[PDB]
Amino acid sequence: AESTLGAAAAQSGRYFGTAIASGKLGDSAYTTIASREFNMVTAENEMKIDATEPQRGQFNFSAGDRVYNWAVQNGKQVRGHTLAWHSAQPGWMQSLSGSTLRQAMIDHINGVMGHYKGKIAQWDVVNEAFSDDGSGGRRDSNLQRTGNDWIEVAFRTARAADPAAKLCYNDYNIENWTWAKTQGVYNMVRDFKQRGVPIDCVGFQSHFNSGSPYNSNFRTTLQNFAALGVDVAITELDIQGASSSTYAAVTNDCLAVSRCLGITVWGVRDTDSWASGDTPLLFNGDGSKKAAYTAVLNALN
Ligand SMILES: O[C@@H]1[C@@H](O)[C@H](O[C@@H]2CO[C@@H](O)[C@H](O)[C@H]2O)OC[C@H]1O
Numbered sequence: 001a002e003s004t005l006g007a008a009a010a011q012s013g014r015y016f017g018t019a020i021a022s023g024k025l026g027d028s029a030y031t032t033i034a035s036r037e038f039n040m041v042t043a044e045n046e047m048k049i050d051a052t053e054p055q056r057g058q059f060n061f062s063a064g065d066r067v068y069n070w071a072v073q074n075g076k077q078v079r080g081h082t083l084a085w086h087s088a089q090p091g092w093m094q095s096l097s098g099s100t101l102r103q104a105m106i107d108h109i110n111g112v113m114g115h116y117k118g119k120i121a122q123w124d125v126v127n128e129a130f131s132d133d134g135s136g137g138r139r140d141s142n143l144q145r146t147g148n149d150w151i152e153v154a155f156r157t158a159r160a161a162d163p164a165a166k167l168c169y170n171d172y173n174i175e176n177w178t179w180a181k182t183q184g185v186y187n188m189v190r191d192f193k194q195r196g197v198p199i200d201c202v203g204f205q206s207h208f209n210s211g212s213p214y215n216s217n218f219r220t221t222l223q224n225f226a227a228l229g230v231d232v233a234i235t236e237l238d239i240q241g242a243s244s245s246t247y248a249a250v251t252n253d254c255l256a257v258s259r260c261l262g263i264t265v266w267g268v269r270d271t272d273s274w275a276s277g278d279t280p281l282l283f284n285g286d287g288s289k290k291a292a293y294t295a296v297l298n299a300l301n
């Protein structure tokens, strides 16, 4: 097996995943495809900071749990997304700084991971901490203003919180090997690995489009981060115009790297994409397969 994306990836030790939006689970066409094709689920919004801790010190896991439970009941594993981020913060957290803010970061990591303890295959512990200004440096958030070690502390906290889970750093525009952002992250992870900061994996969101095109040095990137001693994962894949060439290229990149755990596409049908107008996923609004679907399946087989 062979007939579906997740099974085919499973033949070679990997997964094929999707993002799930709880708001679409009452649509049987959505859940039929989702349930059938994928063996990994990420929650598109329901584990973001403002969804799990909207009030200081009180957690809310309902929408979270509805996605966690749907995935488990239909035989998939789960990726957690995401524990520490500059964006999607509640106002209470947005208002803090320095060590108060750092302490809220640690408490947030512990509350959320504690709730799903032992039930999450991978966690995006830190998401999108690097600038888009071409410098290669960190972003200038409230989190950075507590001190440069915030990322390190995030990972150490997360490790204590749930020893069972792989810990990922996750970002976008880090797929092109020659670009400054990529090299900034590569440099950071290498520093971490030299000093024993517990980072298990790196997540390449892999949003390909006109402002950040696919480039065949994606393979080089994956290989290079792998040699540092971490797993790599494609976490939010989508491709503007869904060319079959390019969907097969990305897939074979992952299949060439043995520390590449798997592929997640960011949505089930074109109509469920953050960029629906770009029709960048593997199923049409109909529910019918697109041409890229077959190319991904052949590469997997
Ligand atoms: O932000 C990043 C872009 O700056 C990067 O741009 C590519 C770099 O090399 C150029 O010769 C390519 O044409 C250009 O598209 O691509 C990735 C993106 O994340």
Ligand SMILES: O[C@@H]1[C@@H](O)[C@H](O[C@@H]2CO[C@@H](O)[C@H](O)[C@H]2O)OC[C@H]1O
Pocket: 044, 045, 172, 207, 274
């Ligand atoms: O929940 C949705 C997010 O998953 C989505 O995230 C997108 C990821 O790529 C970024 O470059 C896009 O700008 C970003 O929007 O965004 C919409 C949100 O509802």
